[PDB]
């Protein structure tokens, strides 16, 4: 499988520091069920997205779903089944930070871990069980799919 | 009372101790009083040269030139062996004096 | 009264770290108090 | 003054700031025309950053392939604001302008006169003191 994380989230702001950036947009999002916090930057242009929408996101570190690395290499003419097909919105980065609330002695009940995918950053907040998976400097790829 | 705590090495706090270091580390650490008064040294010699930068820079400027950039040279070792700054590391403190 | 060589003299407040008179506190941070500084357009370094 | 004496210039130092942007996005065909322009390419074409519904590459990525060797650096966009360093958005800029590179890759932040010129500490000083003349020279072509 290689899925680092998966939930479903809803939007409650688009933009509370303003339009910065014309294709890209930072949706601020919860999840219900893990209650998960999201900030999240989407290009709005080819992905248009609205307050109160609800998405499917998983973070994976495969999208072969067999377990074989991507390289982190461009192959558009690779046939082998993708789970990239069943979402809508792909994108490929790298953890680069997991902040946490632990202290010099007790452990981190949350976490935060930070994902650059070309400059779009993310940043997945939340309990520490539900962020085992991410290490940094480990490539990850985002997995997004709008819910009627 | 910043310098000590962030500068004074804690052999004191076993739970500390078991964050940071390995297991192995920790009890050689805690057990034997050799390498706790190697540390109280290294501390006594970083405040007495604590003074003499105070006497170097009365004004209380920090920013000096120097050859090596220690920070950045610590970031290129950390990149290039991956550590991992979560787990507890297998580096001794007499090693690193 | 005063000294010879010396016409005017300016009397005022530095803001700047450098003509700020700094110390170590108790506590061993630096602290830069403000104090008064004079200047003069005249030279006569061994009186003054 | 033991910091490099020339850095990028006009139309390249504008062009890198809007390249570096963080909604710059390069098609396929854009990607590879630029990708001829660099000598020290090892021909490997990188991911995308977004796969769908289209792949689209970033200046970042592209800047990331031109940036030699594993070199790391912090910088701040010449548009930062103070308050941002003791927000709670830290280390995601809302703005993109905090410079973060890690690795040899830019990660993340604007690039402008602060982290490509001649002051002391930029992305250019960190690649002599790092990689070395030759390599930056490569480096200061590429960019170009």
């Given at each position: 499988?290689?899925?680092?994380?998966?939930?479903?989230?809803?939007?409650?702001?688009?933009?509370?520091?303003?339009?910065?950036?014309?294709?890209?947009?930072?949706?601020?999002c919860?999840?219900?069920?893990?209650?998960?916090?999201?900030?999240?930057?989407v290009?709005?242009?080819?992905?248009?997205?609205?307050?109160?929408?609800?998405?499917?996101?998983?973070?994976?570190?495969?999208?072969?779903?067999?377990?074989?690395?991507?390289?982190?290499?461009?192959?558009?003419?690779?046939?082998?089944?993708?789970?990239?097909?069943?979402?809508?919105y792909?994108?490929?980065?790298?953890?680069?930070?997991?902040?946490?609330?632990?202290?010099?002695?007790?452990?981190?009940?949350?976490?935060?871990?930070?994902?650059?995918?070309?400059?779009?950053?993310?940043?997945?907040?939340?309990?520490?069980?539900?962020?085992?998976?991410?290490?940094?400097?480990?490539?990850?790829?985002?997995?997004?799919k709008?819910?009627? | 009372?910043?310098?000590?705590?962030?500068?004074?090495?804690?052999?004191?706090?076993?739970r500390?101790?078991?964050?940071?270091?390995?297991?192995?580390?920790?009890?050689?650490?805690?057990?034997?009083?050799?390498?706790?008064?190697?540390?109280?040294?290294?501390?006594?010699?970083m405040?007495?040269?604590?003074?003499?930068?105070?006497?170097?820079?009365?004004?209380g400027?920090?920013?000096?030139?120097?050859?090596?950039?220690?920070?950045?040279?610590?970031?290129?070792?950390?990149?290039?062996?991956?550590?991992?700054?979560?787990?507890?590391?297998?580096?001794?403190?007499?090693?690193?004096? | 009264?005063?000294?010879?060589?010396?016409?005017?003299?300016?009397?005022?407040?530095?803001?700047?770290?450098?003509?700020?008179?700094?110390?170590?506190?108790?506590?061993?941070?630096?602290?830069?108090?403000?104090?008064?500084?004079?200047?003069?357009?005249?030279?006569?370094?061994?009186?003054? | 003054?033991?910091?490099?004496?020339?850095?990028?210039?006009?139309?390249?130092?504008?062009?890198?700031?809007?390249?570096?942007?963080?909604?710059?996005?390069?098609?396929?065909?854009?990607?590879?025309?630029?990708?001829?322009?660099?000598?020290?390419?090892?021909?490997?074409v990188?991911?995308?950053?977004?796969?769908?519904?289209?792949?689209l590459?970033?200046?970042?990525?592209?800047?990331?392939?031109?940036?030699?060797?594993?070199?790391?650096?912090?910088?701040?966009?010449?548009?930062?604001?103070?308050?941002?360093?003791?927000?709670?958005?830290?280390?995601?800029?809302?703005?993109?302008?905090?410079?973060?590179?890690?690795?040899?890759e830019?990660?993340?932040?604007?690039?402008?006169?602060?982290?490509?010129?001649?002051?002391?500490?930029?992305?250019?000083?960190?690649?002599?003191?790092?990689?070395?003349?030759?390599?930056?020279?490569?480096?200061?072509?590429?960019?170009?």
């Amino acid at each position: 499988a290689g899925i680092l994380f998966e939930d479903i989230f809803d939007v409650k702001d688009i933009d509370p520091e303003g339009k910065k950036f014309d294709r890209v947009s930072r949706l601020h999002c919860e999840s219900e069920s893990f209650k998960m916090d999201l900030i999240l930057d989407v290009n709005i242009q080819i992905y248009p997205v609205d307050l109160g929408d609800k998405f499917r996101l998983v973070i994976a570190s495969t999208l072969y779903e067999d377990g074989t690395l991507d390289d982190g290499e461009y192959n558009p003419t690779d046939d082998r089944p993708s789970r990239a097909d069943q979402f809508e919105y792909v994108m490929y980065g790298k953890v680069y930070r997991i902040e946490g609330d632990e202290t010099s002695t007790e452990a981190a009940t949350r976490l935060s871990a930070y994902v650059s995918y070309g400059g779009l950053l993310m940043r997945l907040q939340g309990d520490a069980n539900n962020l085992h998976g991410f290490e940094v400097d480990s490539r990850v790829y985002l997995l997004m799919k709008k819910l009627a | 009372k910043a310098f000590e705590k962030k500068f004074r090495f804690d052999y004191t706090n076993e739970r500390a101790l078991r964050r940071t270091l390995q297991e192995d580390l920790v009890k050689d650490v805690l057990s034997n009083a050799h390498i706790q008064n190697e540390l109280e040294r290294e501390f006594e010699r970083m405040r007495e040269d604590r003074e003499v930068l105070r006497v170097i820079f009365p004004t209380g400027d920090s920013k000096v030139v120097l050859p090596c950039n220690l920070l950045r040279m610590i970031w290129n070792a950390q990149k290039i062996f991956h550590i991992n700054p979560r787990l507890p590391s297998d580096l001794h403190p007499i090693k690193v004096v | 009264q005063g000294i010879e060589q010396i016409s005017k003299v300016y009397m005022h407040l530095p803001q700047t770290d450098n003509k700020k008179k700094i110390i170590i506190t108790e506590d061993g941070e630096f602290k830069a108090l403000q104090e008064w500084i004079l200047e003069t357009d005249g030279v006569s370094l061994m009186r003054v | 003054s033991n910091r490099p004496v020339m850095g990028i210039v006009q139309d390249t130092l504008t062009a890198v700031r809007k390249f570096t942007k963080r909604d710059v996005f390069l098609e396929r065909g854009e990607v590879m025309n630029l990708l001829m322009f660099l000598s020290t390419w090892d021909g490997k074409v990188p991911q995308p950053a977004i796969l769908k519904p289209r792949p689209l590459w970033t200046g970042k990525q592209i800047f990331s392939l031109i940036i030699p060797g594993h070199i790391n650096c912090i910088r701040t966009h010449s548009t930062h604001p103070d308050d941002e360093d003791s927000g709670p958005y830290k280390h995601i800029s809302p703005g993109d302008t905090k410079v973060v590179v890690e690795n040899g890759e830019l990660i993340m932040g604007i690039l402008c006169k602060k982290s490509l010129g001649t002051s002391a500490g930029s992305l250019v000083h960190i690649s002599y003191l790092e990689m070395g003349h030759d390599i930056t020279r490569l480096f200061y072509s590429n960019i170009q």
